[PDB]
């Protein structure tokens, strides 16, 4: 009896047990989410506890079989995926401390409350501070809200973070990973596949090179935004300096969407909205998903099951039942695919339906694989497929074919410039912020930043890379990066950069193979069957093959290249160079609002 066949038998047992347990847990979770009562909460908690206990015992058993003496590659990948024990390696004393620290940080972040002048009320993060940051245009109010939310949370969160870092570093060291940063980067690692190999170290260099290529376009966009913001606050903004942190349209600066109203190039020209046509034609909730299914059939992807239409919640119930209206796509397992969404008759819900249908299509595509190999190729693959569908479903050509936009519609250069400007804000504002935050966390975990520079180095990197400067000086009492939800919830934050790059790589490859003539930002892959079969080659691999091979299949190269992203924004680059002739395209670290 060779070890290989013993592992085969063990995995054959594990697949059958795990599939049923996972289906039961997912069904309980769906019932809770679409029916919010304490009884459903009890059922969900019990099912989750059962699944966790089973997975823990199976992971303990799987280690007995040595990873060596294995020949088949798929079995080796499955056993490696199952054998990862996570935080179990930590002792009894440290595990409880880590759980307590994580729960305390989550509760402190959730229990947000900053008082206001005149003792008017008490404002939480939502919806008080969020609305104030999103809508107010008063320097004093935004500065006060930003400072209060920063201090009231960071002062409490600072002591916990160092102990959390120490514990997580120890845990990573036990698992043979150098530190927590290496453990987080180990999600992009490929071994034993020549010419398809990747290393945890090379990811940093790839990200650095991609950002270095991105930087000029971001510089032009930042200079334009600074010039436009000069009007609102002439006294507070230097012409050739970094922008104030609290004036970026949101609490942290992750997105720049809310600054569109100030910085719309052509105010006279309106945007393309088809809500009125949908209302006039009595478009109901079902029609939108019907049209999304029609589009996916057009690309020659398969239809929707008959369990999707009967069991999904495609509209708010209307009864007393309380639901969470966050739109999600559910893959319960064993052939059950559903969508939960409180649909309204708007264009935004049209695009969201297309996105969720793309997620359901990916889930249906990779269903053939075993249980432990049913997911995106990497952590960033699953959302790019959703994003490209909403990219396609917004072009005026599609909305003219569907009958919403009138046939005599005429496209303006100005309207296209406005659309590209909004897209550029939303997509490009987050890239420097994401890269800088992940670089800072990697440096902190690696120990290259001493405990007395956690706030000097953070703002120094923000000045150098992002182009933003703090409004008021902060000592080591403050912990600015810990105010963000992801940092306080121990979530990886490097899946928002690779996703953005992969989305445009896919949307360039498919548009190329769909025989399209014209600018990339106006492309439609509907009524093209080559794109559907070029996409199905990647969507049906799951995790069976390395992500390098999966990427090469659709685009043609085994590397993350940011050339298509710049190709998408080619029309905007020329316009932003035209408008920024007089202004200075750059920022200098030295100047600071403190002086």
């Amino acid at each position: 009896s060779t070890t290989e066949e013993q592992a085969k038998t063990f995995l054959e047992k594990f697949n059958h047990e795990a599939e049923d347990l996972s289906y039961q847990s997912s069904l309980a979770s769906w019932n809770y989410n679409t029916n919010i009562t304490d009884e459903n909460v009890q059922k969900m908690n019990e099912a989750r506890a059962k699944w966790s206990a089973f997975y823990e015992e199976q992971s303990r058993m799987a280690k007995t079989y040595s990873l060596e003496e294995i020949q088949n590659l798929t079995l080796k990948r499955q056993l490696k995926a199952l054998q990862q024990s996570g935080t179990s390696v930590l002792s009894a004393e440290k595990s409880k401390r880590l759980n307590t620290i994580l729960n305390t940080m989550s509760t402190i972040y959730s229990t947000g409350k900053v008082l206001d002048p005149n003792t008017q009320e008490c404002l939480a993060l939502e919806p008080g501070l969020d609305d104030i940051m999103e809508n107010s245009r008063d320097y004093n109010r935004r500065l006060w809200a930003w400072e209060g939310w920063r201090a009231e949370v960071g002062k409490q969160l600072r002591p916990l973070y160092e102990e959390y870092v120490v514990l997580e570093n120890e845990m990573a060291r036990a698992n043979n990973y150098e530190d927590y940063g290496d453990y987080w980067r180990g999600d992009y690692e490929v071994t034993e596949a020549g010419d398809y190999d990747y290393s945890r170290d090379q990811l940093m260099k790839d990200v650095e090179n991609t950002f270095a290529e991105i930087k000029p376009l971001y510089e032009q966009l930042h200079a334009y935004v600074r010039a436009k913001l000069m009007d609102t606050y002439p006294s507070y903004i230097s012409p050739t300096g970094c922008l104030p942190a609290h004036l970026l349209g949101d609490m942290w600066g992750r997105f720049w969407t809310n600054l569109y109203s100030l910085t719309v190039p052509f105010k006279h020209k309106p945007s393309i909205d088809v809500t009125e046509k949908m209302k006039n034609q009595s478009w109901d909730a079902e029609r939108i998903f019907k049209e999304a299914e029609k589009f996916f059939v057009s690309i020659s992807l398969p239809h929707m099951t008959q369990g999707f239409w009967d069991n999904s919640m495609l509209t708010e119930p209307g009864d007393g039942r309380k639901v969470v209206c966050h739109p999600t796509a559910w893959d319960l397992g064993k052939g059950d695919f559903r969508i939960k969404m409180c649909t309204k008759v708007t264009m935004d819900d049209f695009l969201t339906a297309h996105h969720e249908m793309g997620h359901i299509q990916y889930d249906m595509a990779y269903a053939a694989q075993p249980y432990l190999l049913r997911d995106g190729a990497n952590e960033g693959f699953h959302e790019a497929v959703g994003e490209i569908m909403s990219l396609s479903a917004a072009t005026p050509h599609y909305l003219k074919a569907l009958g919403l936009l009138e046939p005599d519609f005429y496209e303006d250069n100005e309207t296209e410039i406005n659309f590209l400007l909004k897209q550029a804000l939303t997509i490009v504002g987050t890239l420097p912020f994401t890269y800088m935050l992940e670089k800072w966390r990697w440096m902190v975990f690696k120990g290259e930043i001493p405990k007395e520079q956690w706030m000097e180095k953070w703002w120094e990197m923000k000045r150098e890379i992002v182009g933003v400067v703090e409004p008021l000086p902060h000592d080591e009492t403050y912990c600015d990066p810990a105010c963000l939800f992801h940092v306080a919830e121990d979530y990886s934050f490097i899946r928002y950069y690779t996703r953005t790059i992969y989305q445009f790589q896919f949307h360039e490859a498919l548009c190329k193979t769909a025989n399209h003539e014209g600018a990339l930002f106006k492309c439609d892959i509907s009524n093209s069957t080559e794109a559907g079969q070029r996409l199905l080659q990647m969507l049906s691999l799951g995790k069976s093959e390395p992500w390098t091979l999966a990427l090469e299949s659709i685009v043609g190269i085994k590397t993350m290249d940011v050339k298509p992203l710049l190709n998408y924004f080619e029309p905007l680059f020329t316009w932003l160079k035209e408008q920024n002739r007089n202004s200075f395209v750059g920022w200098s670290t030295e100047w600071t609002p403190y002086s």
Binding site: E5, T9, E12, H16, T64, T305, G307, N311, K334, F337
Partner: protein, 194 residues
Amino acid sequence: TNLCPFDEVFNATRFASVYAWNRKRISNCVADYSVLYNLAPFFTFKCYGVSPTKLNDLCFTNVYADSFVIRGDEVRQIAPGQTGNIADYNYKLPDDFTGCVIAWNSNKLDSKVSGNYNYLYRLFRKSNLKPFERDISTEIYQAGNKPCNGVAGFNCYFPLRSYSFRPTYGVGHQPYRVVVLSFELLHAPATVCG
């Protein structure tokens, strides 16, 4: 007229499992084959070795009705020369077969919301099944170099799993009822004519 005991198999109330399927021997009867049409969407009506174009006006010495319940995806393994787990370690049809396999969807009958664990199947056995063999023995399987001794711990596995059907599954996992009508004509008998 010896009308066959059909309508006591196609219209039964409890089909058996696939590890111990149900075999009925039909002989000395008239076999009307227009009763099937009204039963259900009998989408699987494959016939191997004979011609199903209403050529059943011949005479056969024996008819064998083998009934069981399987998954939707596994009704393609009821065929000559197939491999899987409903063939290797379960009901296996010979390479040369002269019969008709009828499989139809019975979701409304055999699926309960909480689950239907009444049906079972076999996951592990030492060697593949010879055609038309049954193995109802339940001995602890051994994948290692240690005696089982009657306890299922490490490397010792109970042989038969459970299907556990539910109404919310996909069509690929819903329960399908399968009846196999094997025919047999020996050295010139004239027993069952239709």
